[PDB]
Design a protein around this ligand. Structure first.
Ligand SMILES: Nc1ncnc2c1ncn2[C@@H]1O[C@H](COP(=O)(O)OP(=O)(O)O)[C@@H](O)[C@H]1O
Ligand SMILES: Nc1ncnc2c1ncn2[C@@H]1O[C@H](COP(=O)(O)OP(=O)(O)O)[C@@H](O)[C@H]1O
Ligand SMILES: O=P(O)(O)OCc1ccccc1
Ligand SMILES: O=P(O)(O)OCc1ccccc1
Lengths: 238, 260
């Protein structure tokens, strides 16, 4: 009823330019801000450099085109599961029981969409109080052999499944800009979105809002979870 | 249909006198022996000290009785998934693509049985060449809240799913004995296990095995057999013994055949 769906993007929980680099101190602070908020939440996290570096090297986004990708796909699946354990370790240390739910081990994909045919296990985990944590992963594809599911679409699947009150995207940017802030230093911040970004409007209702907040700014996620207005990008409408 | 189902028990893959302790190098050698055999295999591993230590302190096997067990159950699931990553890393280093498939995140249990309603991800992973690795875990239970699934139960599921040609159990014993060899020096190795022999195991004239430990271990092996398939119990701490057994050679082991 009052659950907040939060995605910890790979840009903050990992160093995207350095393969297999976990930002332990950042995730620890974000997990503390989640605990200090006292809110009921469900956490998703991205893959970051635990998936994108090897995927681009072997063109995993193109599907199964040669046998050389099979060890690379297994390597990425191990990296994302090891990253999820690191995230769960920080969650357990903050008194937040949780467990990694790898999409590649229990779901499939078809036409770029994650298919959840059996919702019972994840729903029983949420009932038990052990927060199920999905994440970006390589998933068996029904036509391409394998495909890549993003942390963003896991949010979409979970938003439709559990109907959260509020959706929060944690990234390494203050919000949505008119251009890449790391490339265009002139780009200016976009506070509200109603008319890369299109998924925020697909999970909004007449009461539910979607936020994009900077996870590298200390206490900004905590203040957002506490209901205070912060520097961010918010989506409304439908 | 030449696949071999292998159970890497927690007694060899983990140090069980020490919580959360990995035997990286028994496992490294075991992964090397699996690769050198050239056989089509599918690996299940146990939890060992990565699950038993906390489950025995918080009575996880009895189900959800108090709220204080929830953080303990979540810790076990994290530990078993961390253990599976280390096992998979050894398989990946030997050129064997594999992926961890945690039963607690994929399936549910009901009256001591692991319920697998959707077999598509595991079957699709095996078809891709990425071996799906299940393991002992804490699993949501339809009536007990949560329950413990063992490696043997994961073997039973994959056995009927893929119909393997041979089943192998890996432990720190040379094979099945008439009693605990670590405590009883008069224990006698049982080289062959049949269903004539299993029915005789129910007899306990001196009432020295009231829990049916030998009968239960025999049943766990015979359930992996039928009119064709044979189940083997081999010592993973003996170098090259698993490699020779996978090659078809004769090694010191316990053999199960015939079926139920
Ligand atoms: N118009 C834009 N506004 C904001 N950020 C942008 C824009 N275009 C590109 N970006 C870049 O996209 C990155 C975030 O994307 P992504 O990696 O999907 O987030 P996460 O890893 O948190 O899921 C930011 O680091 C930012 O530099
Ligand atoms: N009849 C028996 N035959 C062989 N081992 C036995 C017997 N009874 C008890 N044991 C003991 O039980 C242990 C089995 O460990 P187990 O819990 O099965 O580990 P795993 O499941 O990881 O193989 C052995 O180390 C052995 O000392
Ligand atoms: O972009 P996110 O962080 O959601 O990760 C998606 C992903 C996962 C695995 C390999 C490549 C890409
Ligand atoms: O008996 P195995 O070695 O398969 O261990 C299964 C298990 C899993 C979680 C907690 C305790 C025990």
């Amino acid at each position: 009823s009052h659950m907040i769906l939060i995605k910890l993007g790979g840009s903050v929980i990992t160093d995207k330019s350095e393969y297999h680099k976990f930002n332990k101190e950042t995730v620890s602070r974000l997990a503390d801000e989640i605990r200090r908020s006292g809110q009921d939440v469900m956490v998703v996290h991205g893959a970051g450099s635990f998936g994108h570096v090897i995927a681009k090297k072997y063109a995993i986004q193109d599907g199964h085109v040669d046998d050389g990708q099979i060890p690379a796909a297994a390597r990425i699946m191990c990296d994302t599961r090891e990253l999820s354990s690191m995230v769960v370790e920080e969650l357990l240390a903050q008194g937040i029981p949780a467990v990694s739910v790898a999409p590649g081990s229990c779901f499939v994909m078809e036409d770029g969409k994650l298919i959840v045919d059996n919702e019972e296990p994840i729903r029983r985990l949420a009932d038990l109080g052990i927060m199920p944590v999905m994440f970006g992963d390589v998933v068996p594809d029904r036509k391409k052999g394998f495909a890549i599911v993003s942390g963003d679409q896991c949010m979409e699947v979970l938003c439709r499944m559990f109907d959260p009150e509020k959706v929060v995207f944690v990234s390494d940017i203050d919000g949505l800009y008119t251009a890449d802030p790391k490339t265009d230093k002139k780009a200016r911040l976009i506070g509200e979105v109603t008319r890369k970004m299109e998924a925020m409007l697909r999970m909004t209702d007449r009461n539910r809002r979607c936020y994009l907040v900077n996870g590298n700014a200390p206490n900004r996620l905590y203040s957002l979870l506490k209901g205070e207005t912060v520097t961010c990008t918010v989506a409304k409408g439908g």
